[PDB]
Write a protein that binds this DNA or RNA. Structure first.
Lengths: 52, 134, 52, 51, 93, 187
RNA sequence: CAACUUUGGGGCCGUUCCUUGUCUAUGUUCCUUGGAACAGGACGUCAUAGAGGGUGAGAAUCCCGUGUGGCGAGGAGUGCG
RNA sequence: CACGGACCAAGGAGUCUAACGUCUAUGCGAGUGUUUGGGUGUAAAACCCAUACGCGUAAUGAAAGUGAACGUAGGUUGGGGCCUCGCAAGAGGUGCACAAUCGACCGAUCCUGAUGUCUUCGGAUGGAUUUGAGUAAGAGCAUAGCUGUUGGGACCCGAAAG
């Protein structure tokens, strides 16, 4: 049994927005952002500070 | 201090209209107590057994008064004898009702009580227990 | 037979009729008993007068 | 006593025979209890409705 | 305590009966005549087992009317109280 | 308090809701009826025996059992192979160890054979106007264990002594048997 | 050894079940409106049929059906007369 | 500060349920519950029903077991309400429910150890306290409702994943 055991960030405004594919700007990594994520991650930074 | 009860049993409401009449006018303490008692809820209007009636009748100087229970009346299988009395309450279990009439006594409703003894005269009140509840 | 009486019980297993809690429906008869009218301390007026 | 009742014919008249009541008629009237039953009975011929 | 595996809860039907009730077993038409008529040689007999009551307990007190009971299990005081009222117990299984 | 669900699993699939109830009832009553029109003069049910039930919680009762025995029905004077046609159940893996039950069952059988008429195989087959339950016609009543009224008889043990002492010797017979063994093995 | 007892195998017609067909009452009268009457009003009829649908708008009574019954054909396999 | 909002219509978010709990309404009351089911019918309705079974009417101890009245169902105090007296005001007797307090009974624990006994079994009687959510003349069953707890998809949409 034991033997058997074993980036390119993009502000996603203007032309890039709503594209479920890739933008113009190409790299094997990519990350779209709109402001709501900025709100969310702001809130998470707040709450983790309050968790410390 | 309540104004009028929680049910819509119409007959009880007519009864309560009557007892408002008396406790407004006559200023006996009796009518107040039964009326206040009728406003209670079912737990707080517990049932009273006829054995308890008999203990109350076995009081000194108490055989010829009329007992009152306000609420509902039970039979009790335990006693075998029972006196011959004039008894009033809202609701009578049939076994106890017949037990009383077998003794010979009289079972009445509270309109009939208020006919006979309006002011609470020659009367007394009982109340069943409550401490059997958690 | 089917609904019971004072003489014949229900025609039904382990049944009696209901009972009343009050003998008579009408109260005003009760209040116009002679005995209660004798037992009563007298009336108000049901129209209070305007005082000051 | 149960006061009396008249009895009628088909074409209708006061037939001279008369019955007493069965004393259910002197039994009470509790509309709260009729109503809160009647809900519960009239609910019972119900069949399903679902998605 | 000590265990007995696949214990099956029928050894322990022991519906109690107090001495209080004990004429509700009897129907009324019998009950009143036998409430009177307290002789021996009409001894009204009682099958607690048939009524679904295994063992007798004593809480109550009883008149002196003598009455016979059939049961398995009893307590001492209840039996003594029966003997005082002049009824007797007869043990059926 | 402690309170127990068994709802952790995928229960919503396996839910079975008996709306089917009166429809089934009507289907059933129709089964009864057409069984009758198939079996026309027969009762839709057999004659069944009387048995005292097990398990002392219940052993006071008596119950409509399965089947009359070979011994019983033999003493009634007729075979399994005939009785099964006449409408009578037979359970072979049962034994008769109470004569009271035995005579009860055979009285029931005699009452049956008296209460019937048998159309033969020959022919004309008279009109017989069926009844639809054997067990209603041949009821199964708990007996009288005792007469209602007696006189008192006593022997002065008062039966608490007997129960206590019987339980005690039941507890202590095996140890008293070991002491008897020791007394027998002495010299 | 002793007596007794009991036997079945088809075809025919009805019955049964299924499938199916077919038949099984009562105003289309008068007035008003409006494109039209199934609306409104009056007088009537039938009902074991007033459930549903249609028809130039809410139709018991114009129709089909329903309700109650009856006259059939085809199969099946015998539950028995 | 940051996040959402171009404009309108329509859609759209604490619900259904199971097991429990309190409160309230109603029935019935030492009982209560028709509906698994049988009969019955104008047909999923409605009406009637035995026999059963639950939950309750008795706890206690790990069990084996054992199983609740000295009394007027106790004594003391308060105790609404009634009764008597009192023109009243007040006093007195009664005193339910309830509360406190002391006792009694049941069960558990220790000792005592009777008429007797396979002489080691039985367990009379009286004591020691500590204890129960007990008893100390019952109160609960069923339904519905407003609701709360937990699990279920769980107020709705949304998450790295295996």
């Amino acid at each position: 049994k034991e033997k058997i055991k074993a980036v390119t960030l993009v502000v996603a405004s203007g032309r890039n927005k709503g594209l479920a594919g890739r933008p113009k700007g190409v790299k094997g990594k990519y990350k779209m952002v709109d402001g709501v994520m900025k709100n969310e991650q702001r809130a998470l930074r707040r709450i983790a500070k309050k968790h410390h | 201090h309540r104004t009028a009860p929680k049910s819509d049993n119409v007959y009880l409401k007519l009864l309560v209209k009557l007892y408002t009449f008396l406790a407004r006018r006559t200023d006996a303490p009796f009518n107040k107590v039964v009326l206040k008692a009728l406003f209670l809820s079912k737990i707080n209007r517990p049932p009273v057994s006829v054995s308890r009636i008999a203990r109350a009748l076995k009081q000194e100087g108490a055989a010829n008064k009329t007992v009152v229970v306000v609420g509902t009346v039970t039979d009790d299988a335990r006693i075998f004898e029972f006196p011959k009395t004039t008894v009033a309450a809202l609701r009578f279990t049939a076994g106890a009702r017949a037990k009383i009439v077998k003794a010979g006594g009289e079972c009445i409703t509270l309109d009939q009580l208020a006919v006979r003894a309006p002011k609470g005269q020659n009367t007394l009140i009982l109340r069943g227990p409550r401490n059997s509840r958690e | 037979q089917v609904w019971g009486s004072e003489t014949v019980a229900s025609s039904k297993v382990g049944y009696t009729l209901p009972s009343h809690i009050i003998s008579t429906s009408d109260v005003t008869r009760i209040i116009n008993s002679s005995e209660i009218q004798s037992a009563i301390r007298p009336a108000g007026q049901a129209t209070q007068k305007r005082t000051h | 006593s149960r006061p009396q009742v008249t009895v009628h014919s088909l074409t209708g008249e006061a037939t001279a025979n008369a019955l007493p009541l069965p004393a259910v008629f002197s039994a009470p009237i509790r509309p709260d209890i009729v109503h809160t039953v009647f809900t519960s009975v009239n609910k019972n011929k119900r069949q399903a409705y679902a998605v | 305590g000590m265990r007995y595996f696949h214990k099956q809860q029928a050894h322990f039907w022991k519906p109690v009966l107090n001495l209080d009730k004990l004429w509700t077993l009897i129907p009324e038409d019998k009950r009143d005549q036998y409430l009177k008529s307290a002789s021996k040689e009409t001894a009204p007999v009682i099958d607690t087992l048939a009524a679904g009551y295994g063992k007798i307990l004593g809480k109550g007190r009883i008149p002196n009317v003598p009455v016979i009971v059939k049961a398995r299990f009893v307590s001492k005081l209840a039996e003594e109280k029966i003997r005082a009222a002049g009824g007797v117990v007869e043990l059926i299984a | 308090p402690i309170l127990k669900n068994h709802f952790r699993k995928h229960w919503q699939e396996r839910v079975k809701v008996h709306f089917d109830q009166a429809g089934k009832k009507v289907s059933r009553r129709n089964a009864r009826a057409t069984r009758a029109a198939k079996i026309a003069p027969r009762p839709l049910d057999l004659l069944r025996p009387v048995v005292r039930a097990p398990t002392v919680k219940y052993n006071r009762k008596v119950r409509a059992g399965r089947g009359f025995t070979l011994a019983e029905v033999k003493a009634a004077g007729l075979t399994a192979a005939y009785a099964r046609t006449i409408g009578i159940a037979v359970d072979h893996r049962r034994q008769n160890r109470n004569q009271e039950i035995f005579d009860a069952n055979v009285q029931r059988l005699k009452e049956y054979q008296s209460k019937i008429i048998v159309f033969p195989r020959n022919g004309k087959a008279p009109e017989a106007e069926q009844v639809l339950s054997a067990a209603a016609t041949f009821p199964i009543a708990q007996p009288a264990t005792d007469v209602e009224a007696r006189a008192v008889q006593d022997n002065g043990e008062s039966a608490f002594r007997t129960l206590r002492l019987a339980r005690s010797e039941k507890k202590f017979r095996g140890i008293r048997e070991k002491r008897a063994r020791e007394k027998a093995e002495a010299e």
